[PDB]
Design a protein around this ligand. Sequence first.
Ligand SMILES: [Cl-]
Ligand SMILES: [Sr+2]
Ligand SMILES: [Sr+2]
Ligand SMILES: [Sr+2]
Length: 357
Amino acid sequence: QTREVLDPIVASLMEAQQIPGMAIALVRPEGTTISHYGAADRETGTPVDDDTLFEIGSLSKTLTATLASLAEVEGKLDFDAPVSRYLPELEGSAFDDISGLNLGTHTGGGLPLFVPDEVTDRASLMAWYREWQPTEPIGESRTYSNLGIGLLGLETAASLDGEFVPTMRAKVLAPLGMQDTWYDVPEARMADYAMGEDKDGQPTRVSPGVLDDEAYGIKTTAADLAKLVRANLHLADVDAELQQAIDATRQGHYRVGDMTQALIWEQYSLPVAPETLRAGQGYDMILEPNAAEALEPPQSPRDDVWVNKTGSTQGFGGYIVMLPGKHTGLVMLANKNYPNDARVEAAYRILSGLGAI
Ligand SMILES: [Cl-]
Ligand SMILES: [Sr+2]
Ligand SMILES: [Sr+2]
Ligand SMILES: [Sr+2]
């Protein structure tokens, strides 16, 4: 079937990259197929199964985006408004000139990638935000930023008068039925938490940190992510405002060379070459400022695109692809941080082999 296309590609991928285990969800009209491969923990050999939790790292940003979008749909958050309107503790800073939308598209004035070590809590974070000077023109340059998506999360929480994680659970996760999705893995599910493996083959598990929940802190299953994918693909039964919020996360906001930056989601018009996709996940895109052009032939969500998002921690490597025009989606989770080049190739081969491209 489907699995005769999928299984040898993942087998070959896990051999070539020495990945201990994977969980894969394929979302199509007709339904969702979940496949589990290998070990959740290389040392114990406990197999990956329907309960195995993977760190999705930077994929967590798509949830942050979604919640921000819902606050927008509810009229509580204005995406074009200065962030300091919702966080008055930043009045008088650069955040008088930077919007939620900038934060959700990484066009916040060159806002850097990492949280600085000197920042150890919310108060030191706010004080750092207050003192920071933009280094790139706002809304005209893209720099991938944990500080930015993190600040969007803090903006959103304030706009909704709630704490980030419980608000995310109540407003996005529970309504999508994502009941295996955690910011903090419960004691009772620790036996289900996969062990990561780093590029050197060493066991590793994500550490907590400032803005962890907002930027990289989700542990979840491939099935749960498939529900977010299903809703993005209009294959779920969802509340109308939540559907709207989800759809709005795929609105194209900036052209960035060959890539279109939507709300955290990144996309390309079809047909797209794999080398273009690989470039999207490379050093030149991820670790350098890229010219970004606001789209004012303003784009509604498109039905002729490859939509993607990578997610990593030190021990884990995830990837989501969505093809709205084919109503098809792919979630690949691994407990090894393996190269993005291989993530793209494997996803392209799977989707092509299934006839979706
Ligand atoms: Cl960070
Ligand atoms: Sr506006
Ligand atoms: Sr936290
Ligand atoms: Sr190859």
